[PDB]
Amino acid sequence: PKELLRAQTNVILLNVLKQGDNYVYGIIKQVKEASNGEMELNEATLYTIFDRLEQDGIISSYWGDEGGRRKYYRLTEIGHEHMRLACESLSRVDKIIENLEANKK
Numbered sequence: 001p002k003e004l005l006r007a008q009t010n011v012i013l014l015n016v017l018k019q020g021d022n023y024v025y026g027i028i029k030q031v032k033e034a035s036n037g038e039m040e041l042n043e044a045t046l047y048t049i050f051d052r053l054e055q056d057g058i059i060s061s062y063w064g065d066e067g068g069r070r071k072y073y074r075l076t077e078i079g080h081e082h083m084r085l086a087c088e089s090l091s092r093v094d095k096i097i098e099n100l101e102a103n104k105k
Protein backbone atom coordinates (compact mmCIF):
# COMPACT_ATOMS: atom_id res chain seq x y z
CA PRO A 1 0.00 0.00 0.00
CA LYS A 2 1.14 3.54 0.83
CA GLU A 3 3.39 2.88 3.85
CA LEU A 4 5.79 0.80 1.88
CA LEU A 5 6.25 3.70 -0.55
CA ARG A 6 6.50 6.26 2.25
CA ALA A 7 9.01 3.87 3.82
CA GLN A 8 10.94 4.16 0.53
CA THR A 9 10.67 7.95 0.21
CA ASN A 10 12.47 8.45 3.53
CA VAL A 11 15.27 5.99 2.74
CA ILE A 12 16.26 7.91 -0.41
CA LEU A 13 15.57 11.31 1.18
CA LEU A 14 17.84 10.07 4.03
CA ASN A 15 20.58 9.63 1.44
CA VAL A 16 20.81 12.88 -0.48
CA LEU A 17 21.49 14.05 3.09
CA LYS A 18 23.89 11.16 3.85
CA GLN A 19 26.12 12.62 1.14
CA GLY A 20 26.22 16.33 2.11
CA ASP A 21 23.85 18.70 3.90
CA ASN A 22 21.31 20.32 1.59
CA TYR A 23 18.16 22.41 1.19
CA VAL A 24 14.92 21.43 -0.52
CA TYR A 25 15.16 23.07 -4.05
CA GLY A 26 18.45 21.33 -4.25
CA ILE A 27 17.27 18.10 -2.63
CA ILE A 28 14.20 18.15 -4.89
CA LYS A 29 16.13 18.45 -8.14
CA GLN A 30 18.93 16.24 -6.80
CA VAL A 31 16.42 13.37 -6.66
CA LYS A 32 14.79 14.35 -9.97
CA GLU A 33 18.17 14.17 -11.71
CA ALA A 34 18.89 10.99 -9.75
CA SER A 35 15.54 9.72 -11.08
CA ASN A 36 16.08 10.55 -14.79
CA GLY A 37 13.02 12.79 -14.50
CA GLU A 38 10.55 10.44 -12.82
CA MET A 39 10.61 11.35 -9.10
CA GLU A 40 9.36 14.93 -8.88
CA LEU A 41 8.96 15.98 -5.25
CA ASN A 42 6.86 18.84 -3.89
CA GLU A 43 8.03 21.55 -1.51
CA ALA A 44 5.03 20.97 0.77
CA THR A 45 5.48 17.19 0.55
CA LEU A 46 9.18 17.28 1.43
CA TYR A 47 8.67 19.69 4.33
CA THR A 48 6.06 17.59 6.14
CA ILE A 49 8.40 14.60 5.83
CA PHE A 50 11.43 16.52 7.12
CA ASP A 51 9.37 17.92 9.98
CA ARG A 52 8.46 14.46 11.19
CA LEU A 53 12.03 13.18 10.82
CA GLU A 54 13.29 16.29 12.61
CA GLN A 55 10.88 15.78 15.50
CA ASP A 56 11.94 12.15 15.80
CA GLY A 57 15.54 13.38 15.85
CA ILE A 58 16.49 11.74 12.55
CA ILE A 59 17.65 15.08 11.06
CA SER A 60 18.12 18.62 12.37
CA SER A 61 18.00 22.09 10.82
CA TYR A 62 20.26 25.14 10.78
CA TRP A 63 20.69 28.36 8.80
CA GLY A 64 23.13 29.31 6.06
CA ASP A 65 25.23 32.37 5.33
CA GLU A 66 24.24 35.54 3.44
CA GLY A 67 21.95 37.17 0.82
CA GLY A 68 18.89 35.50 2.28
CA ARG A 69 17.69 33.03 4.90
CA ARG A 70 18.10 29.39 3.94
CA LYS A 71 17.29 26.27 5.99
CA TYR A 72 19.75 23.38 5.69
CA TYR A 73 19.22 19.76 6.76
CA ARG A 74 21.94 17.34 7.85
CA LEU A 75 22.05 13.65 8.70
CA THR A 76 22.04 13.31 12.48
CA GLU A 77 23.84 10.55 14.39
CA ILE A 78 20.84 8.31 15.06
CA GLY A 79 19.65 8.98 11.52
CA HIS A 80 22.91 7.39 10.39
CA GLU A 81 22.10 4.17 12.27
CA HIS A 82 18.53 4.05 10.94
CA MET A 83 19.78 4.39 7.36
CA ARG A 84 21.94 1.29 7.85
CA LEU A 85 19.27 -0.64 9.74
CA ALA A 86 17.11 -0.31 6.64
CA CYS A 87 20.30 -1.48 4.91
CA GLU A 88 20.84 -4.52 7.13
CA SER A 89 17.11 -5.15 6.68
CA LEU A 90 17.82 -5.68 2.97
CA SER A 91 20.67 -8.09 3.74
CA ARG A 92 18.33 -10.58 5.41
CA VAL A 93 15.10 -10.39 3.38
CA ASP A 94 17.05 -10.54 0.10
CA LYS A 95 18.51 -13.95 0.91
CA ILE A 96 15.35 -15.09 2.72
CA ILE A 97 13.46 -14.71 -0.56
CA GLU A 98 15.93 -16.86 -2.51
CA ASN A 99 16.13 -19.53 0.20
CA LEU A 100 12.35 -19.81 -0.16
CA GLU A 101 12.77 -20.35 -3.90
CA ALA A 102 15.35 -23.01 -2.98
CA ASN A 103 13.18 -24.93 -0.48
CA LYS A 104 11.06 -26.42 -3.30
CA LYS A 105 13.24 -28.17 -5.96
Ligand SMILES: *CC(=O)Nc1ccc2sc3ccccc3c(=O)c2c1
Residues within 6 Å of the ligand: 004, 005, 007, 008, 011, 083, 084, 086, 087, 088, 090
Ligand atom coordinates in the same frame (compact mmCIF):
# COMPACT_ATOMS: atom_id res chain seq x y z
C1 LIG B 1 21.86 0.30 2.27
C2 LIG B 1 20.65 -0.34 1.59
O1 LIG B 1 20.74 -1.43 1.06
N1 LIG B 1 19.48 0.40 1.61
C3 LIG B 1 18.27 0.07 0.96
C4 LIG B 1 18.26 -0.28 -0.40
C5 LIG B 1 17.05 -0.57 -1.05
C6 LIG B 1 15.83 -0.49 -0.35
S1 LIG B 1 14.36 -0.90 -1.26
C7 LIG B 1 13.03 -0.33 -0.24
C8 LIG B 1 11.75 -0.30 -0.82
C9 LIG B 1 10.63 0.09 -0.07
C10 LIG B 1 10.78 0.46 1.27
C11 LIG B 1 12.06 0.43 1.85
C12 LIG B 1 13.20 0.04 1.12
C13 LIG B 1 14.54 0.01 1.80
O2 LIG B 1 14.59 0.20 3.01
C14 LIG B 1 15.82 -0.12 1.01
C15 LIG B 1 17.05 0.14 1.66
